Each structure stands twice: as structure tokens, then as C-alpha cells.
Amino acid sequence: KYTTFQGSQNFRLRIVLATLSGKPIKIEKIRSGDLNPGLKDYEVSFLRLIESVTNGSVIEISYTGTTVIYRPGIIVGGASTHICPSSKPVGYFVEPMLYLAPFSKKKFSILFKGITASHNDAGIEAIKWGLMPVMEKFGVRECALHTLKRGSPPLGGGEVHLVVDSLIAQPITMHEIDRPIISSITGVAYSTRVSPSLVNRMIDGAKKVLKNLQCEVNITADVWRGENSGKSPGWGITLVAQSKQKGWSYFAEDIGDAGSIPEELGEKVACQLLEEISKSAAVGRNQLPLAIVYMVIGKEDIGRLRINKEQIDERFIILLRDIKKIFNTEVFLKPVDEADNEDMIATIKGIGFTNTSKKI
Amino acid sequence: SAEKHLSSVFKFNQHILKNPLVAQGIVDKAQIRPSDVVLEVGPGTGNLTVRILEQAKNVVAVEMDPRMAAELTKRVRGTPVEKKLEIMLGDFMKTELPYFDICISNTPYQISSPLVFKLINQPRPPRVSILMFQREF
């Protein structure tokens, strides 16, 4: 009948996993006890986005809005424009499309409009330099997120264009049982509608923490001014630690609020980046959900990914349990033979998923 | 009626480039930071200057021919980048040049060796300079 879920937890993942698996799902008891029960505006907008890129899907929203029945169709893609409500930035909507774009009948060319940054959702640079590189490791050769206009909160006004030219049968099998060596640190510090000095000052704060390291540190100054700088002033910084040997990356990001010192923010992201590296084995915690899902939908082969003991947190477990409900696939974890660390190897067998929407 | 002074300095008596690829390359390899004031030797008509003017805080174009100086002026008048160009006219070996971070030059080959050492001895000299010399020199 229907695979039933509870609450608003992992709303995007459960819908995305249903779309890839093709199995209808039911999400019930969405904020039942809250004063404003049911789906939020941005959740309803996300469902509309799912339909613009699929065909033949049926989405029922209950009279109270507290229950959703989703019967997925085929992923078709194509060119479209999506208006993101101000409750969430564009990255809230761009991120799930990364899971569906390579397995589509037609190339995804989606134009997203709205706020381009927030404190809780993926930024433009997190996607461009933090997630999309993981996709290329899985065989998505051509993927691009062009930023046409930057829009900072609360008024937004930004525009990003997601273009995924690569249509593939399925992700390649992953074999990463080592700890990548970080070759250099790169990042982007950006600002809109304000003086360049803020961008320079953040770079000084970040470089202060990272100068002790033995690798090169080169942070870009992304100063936006004029018509494309959006409607509200804002600034932020994103740092990426790169491993050129196998094209791996770890990143942290944050944006500045009113009354915040640019130098302090640069130190926060630099400190968080070192926290992320210490907690990571082969991918960061913010990249781990994407890597696991792609390995689940690979060929029917045992792919291996090294994970740190710290990465096995509350979020990791719920992701695995949700995958088992949809795909029935169990992740097997084995200790590494080394004694320097307590890492583990997460071995997942692919379900033999294939891109059947693409005409041959 | 400025002929009195300009004729006392100049008499109002060259091989022009015809390949856009090299001109774009010279600017590209310069890697002009947005906060860099650039000194441009041999601006010519202004093909290279206009590209530099787009990316630079300010551009000081040093020229020796009064006729070509007007050509540069007419190409930049009434434009957003007019306020960021300072055209200088006359022999520039003798004078004390301003401070510049990058030097892009289609130098006259006659003044190649004086120019190479002027930049070297300039107080607080530029960090990078893209100069066009002959193959032997």
C-alpha cells in the first residue's frame, strides 16, 4: 500500500528517496500539535518544484494539511523557473534537485529566484564547491550552478541557474577507504551592497587562524555591487579544504548578521572548518547524506566509504533508517585495521538503479 | 590657444598591432586586482587601455606623441571610466613616476633598457609587469 512516515522530519529526503525508488509514500502527523499545523509554505513550494521536474506524479495534501500522499512519476526535468518563498533560500530547493538531476529524461535547467543565503541552509558556494564536487566523483561530469544575482536576507532578490548537462545511468561505485590528504585551503568571502573592506576584513580573520597550518591559504574576494547585488546588504564567507589527489573537499560556511564584526565571522568559519576536518574521514558531515544516497542507487556492487566515529551522529542514524524503509538497503560498518584512529568503512550494495527515463 | 606651449614641447611630426588575441592575453596574464593602479606605457589608440580601465582602480597612461594622446582622449570621453584615466604626455624617463602596482607596456623598443631598470629602482616598485620586447633583447 503506502510506506508511512511520521512528522516533518526529513521531508525533502523522504520525497526524494520516494522519487528515485518510485515507491509511493505517505507522510502523516505533520506538526499535529502545533498552533499552525500542517505543511509550511516552503514545504508546499518544494512539492510544486518536484512536480515541475517530474511527470505523472500525484500529490494529495489533506484537508488539514497534516497528511501528504505522494505517488511518484518519472523524472523528466526540462527548463523551468521557480520562485522560492522568503521563508527559505534557494539552496533549500537547489539541494534536493542534485539528487534527481543526473537521472532525468531531459537536462535540468532550473532558474531559482529568492534569498541566496541563510544560517541553516546550503549556500551557493557550499553547493558549487562542497556538494557538486562530490557528484563529479560519482560520474556527474557536467554540472553548474551559475549565480546571476546575489540576494541577501531579508529582502533577497537573487537568482541562480542550475544546469546539469550530464545524464547518467547511475552513480559509479565508490571505493574510498583512506583518509585524503588536504593539499590546500581555498574559499570565497562575498558581500553585497556594501564596501569591499568587509570582504577584506573577513579574509584577515580567517587567515589569522589558518596561518599556522603548513598548506597554502587563498580566499577569494567576491565583492558584489550595483544592479546584481540584490536588494539587501549582506556578507559571508565559505572556506573549502581541498585534496587534489582524489578531488575531495571539506567546507564550512556562515553569513554575517547586523551588528556582527567581519573579522569575528572569518575566525568562526576557519575554526569550524578545522572542526569539520577533525570530524571527517573521507567526506564532511554536511556531504555525508549525499554520498550515502548515491551509493545506495549505484550498480549492484559493494561500494566502500570510510567514515569517522564522530560522523555517526543522530542525523546519520535517521538517514540510514529512512533509506531502509524505502530501499530496504542496510549499511554495514566494519572497523578499519588501523590503530591510529577509530574510523569505520561503510559498505553499501547498490540496488541496481538505472536511469530508464532517458531515451535510447 | 594652447599652441604656444604644446608646440614649445612637441613638433607634431610606428608599428600598430593587428591581433586581438595577444592584447587580451597581456591583460589576462597581468591578473589586475581591483585595487591596483596601473601604469600603461605606449597606450596607442587605446585598445589595451580600455580593457585595463575596466578592471583597475585608476590607470595612468604615459604617452610621447601628442596626436595619439588625443585619440586616447576621444575614445574615453563621456564614459564611466573617464574619471579613472590620467593621460600623461611627454618623455617619461626624466620624471618621477607615481606609485603603481602593475605595469603593462607596449614599450617602444628604443626605451626598453631604460624602462626595465626604472621599474626596478622605483621606490616601492611594482609587483608584476608585462612588457613587450624584441626577441633578441
Binding site: 541553516n120 555517526i312 533508517r321 | -
Partner: protein, 97 residues
């Protein structure tokens, strides 16, 4: 307490799982400690210094890749328990079921 078993026991909650062996994906940014604690902890870059720095035919090359993958699958399954093996790959061909 093997965490692998604790993950797939739906009766236990994820919070109850972590502590014995030792919130939501809509928030993309992961949890971090406070800046003052983090700033003190990364006063020195120690504890992360380790992290920082022929086949004759094209046909045979592809066949080698397939065989190497098939060898990897066999090695992992052998390490796994026979009950663990059945739960991951399922019932392999040749099984009388």
C-alpha cells in the same frame, strides 16, 4: 554495543542509540560547539597535522575493472557473517529456497 545492530533496531530511539555505544536533515549546516570553546580548542593546529601535507587491449582493461570489482565483492562478503551476508546481498543464485 555494535552500532550496526543499534541502528536497525527501530524500537530504540536514535538518541538512545548513540549514548550506549559511546536532529533533522532540513538544517543543512551541522551542529558545532560554541565559538569560545572552539576558539580555545583550535589555538594550535596540532591533532590535524597528519591530515595536512598495463593491458594489451582496451578490451582487457575494461574486463580487468569488472573482475577487480567482483573480487572486492567476494572479499567483503567473506569477512561478513553468513547471517550478515544474507541480509546484505540476499539469497545468491544456487540457493535452494
Amino acid at each position: 554495543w555494535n552500532i550496526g545492530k543499534l541502528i536497525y533496531m527501530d524500537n530504540i530511539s536514535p538518541e538512545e542509540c548513540i549514548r550506549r555505544w559511546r536532529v533533522d536533515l532540513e538544517k543543512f549546516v551541522p551542529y558545532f560547539d560554541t565559538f569560545e570553546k572552539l576558539a580555545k580548542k583550535w589555538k594550535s593546529v596540532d591533532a590535524i597535522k597528519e591530515r595536512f601535507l598495463e593491458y594489451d587491449t582496451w578490451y582487457e582493461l575494461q574486463k580487468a575493472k569488472i573482475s577487480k570489482q567482483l573480487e572486492i565483492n567476494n572479499i567483503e562478503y567473506q569477512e561478513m557473517t553468513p547471517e550478515q551476508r544474507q541480509r546484505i546481498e540476499g539469497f545468491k543464485a544456487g540457493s535452494y529456497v
